[model samples]
Target: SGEYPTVNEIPVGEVRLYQIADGVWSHIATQSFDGAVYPSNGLIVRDGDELLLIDTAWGAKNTAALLAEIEKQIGLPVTRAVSTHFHDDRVGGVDVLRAAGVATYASPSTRRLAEAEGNEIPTHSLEGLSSSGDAVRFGPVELFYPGAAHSTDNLVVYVPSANVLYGGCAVHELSSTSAGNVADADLAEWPTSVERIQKHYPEAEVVIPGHGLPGGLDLLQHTANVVKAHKN
Candidate 1:
């Protein structure tokens, strides 16, 4: 687990590209609404000629731009997408991609919650956490759910081959001193959830938070420590 070169960063329409690995990139999109700015992150993973996307931008326009960027960078169509949770930043563009016939994967709770909240629902639901063991592997990525931490159905993607952990919103950046956007968060279980993640993926060198910059395993410990303190 070591750091990789961040090659070819550019502001493409609504996305700021950051090349995390050879075939992996992040599309950082910011949404300004009602005089507030919110930045969101999603991952693009390439395997052979197909691509898998984790999370999505905020709207059709942003998702459109993200799709174009993905195709231009990889020369392959994004056939699969996984919503980390029901959050708008993570799954807001799902319908746009679904109309394009992309297969979207999400947790059962994620689908239920999104539908209840009138958010764009995922095309598919992933179950069998009891049967599949620690992680559910899709292509070259391993999706891990350490229980509800940041959201009700939050998930963190582990690319073992790349030694990268796309924590989405479940984990925080190294500099983050507190848990962010915890309106739907479980304060009681948050610390243990992060602990499980750290214990399960001890070798993760690159930890990408939902917002802000990425860091190493220290981010996991930092999140746990802060939340653990808050539990008191």
Candidate 2:
């Protein structure tokens, strides 16, 4: 019911951008399922004169809209993007990014799964991130696979400079009343994964979930609690 004070807004496609830090922005894109619209959250980080994306918009067309808005308003070309998971909400724009010659990075498992599902595949690998706890630095963000939580290939991105953690799908927004989706979740390992994030990025001042508004450590805790409730 609330909203982040966004720096730029794309009302038509339900895509918006919020400046969280000096050079970091959170980009949101939406998807309609059964007449209900939902938003997916991701990051748009700036390094020097170029930009990096943590996840794509909800779909290719929406991704294109996001890119256009970024270029038009931010005046920075997105040079690289790393999808934190294989789901469409995460990698939906991989093809669009690749077509625009943007280097797209994803876990090897993510690539395989997305490809197997005939979805858009990333152009590069997160340096062979195939197992839990594997970490890699792609462009300006650090990607860490915190085992399976939201999905088998789900991972989190830590922006060390900005002290922001993009907990894609694995972390829940505090307002969530239940585990949002679990079609490919590893419920047994979700708490462990969230704990790993808390342990690894204790200094994170900003934590953005895969959906809804960003918050602090409570988001991670909320997600862990949600997973526990689901299992119980």
Candidate 3:
């Protein structure tokens, strides 16, 4: 009874939601790349009467599956969502979320970029939460813009109550060796951004990357080191 198992009861897709913290769960969505399946991670937390999804799944269809499974298992609707960046893995389900009446938010830059790329765009853009270094609270989560990193619009989400930092693509997974995808990345600013996250949230005991298992402060240090090593 103490073990909270990962839920993968979706009949049609490969998105799995796993419990990581008290009321926090991570959503892993898979898509094939170069004949290999790649998994992207997102955060989900139970708010008062509903749930909040940090990022969408890999696509609209996958997100639909994810939502259905969430409703089936958690029995609470996902009322809000925020895409961490403009990447498909992050905002691909914006349309699905919008159709489901979920209030979706993204950085202005992310909205513009996603629109330009012909991808689904988020409905709201909170400038203070995306541009300013100040932390903005939305319900139980604190969203922080640590400058540019993985992408020009990439940002990190912190659940202060849970002490979990959803680093998205900005924070590298400890098992990652090479910089995954950097077409829109600000390489020079990546290390500094990671450093800022490290300095700002020294109390973040649980750090989750965008593509792998969760770790502690070491993930921040590892991301910083990885960016620096790639820069040289």
Q: What is the TM-score of each candidate against the true structure?
A: 0.90, 0.93, 0.92
Local error of candidate 2 at 73, Å?
Answer: 2.1
- What would the per-residue lDDT of candidate 2 be over residues 1-232, giving only the tens digit for each residue? 2367332444657577788888899988778766877788889989889999888997999999988879876998889888888888988878898899889988789889999998889988766466777777776778888888889889899888889998999998998998887888999999998998899899999999998879998899989999999999
User: Residue 131 error for model 1, in Å?
Assistant: 9.3
| Winning model by lDDT | 2
lDDT (10s digit) by residue, model 3, range 63-163 = 99889878877889898998989989999988988998999998888899999999899999867765537688887798899998888888899998889
Cα lDDT of candidate 3 equals 0.84
lDDT of 1 by residue, 108-162 (tens): 8889999999898998888754221257898879988888788868888988888
RMSD of each: 3.7, 2.4, 2.6
Please give the ranking of all candidate structures by TM-score, highest first, separated by commas: 2, 3, 1
On lDDT, who's better, 2 or 3? 2
Task: Look at candidate 1 and tell me the lDDT of residue 59.
Answer: 75
Question: What ranges in model 2 sit over 4 Å off?
Answer: 5-10
In model 1, which residue pairs have backbone atoms overlapping below 3 Å?
A: none
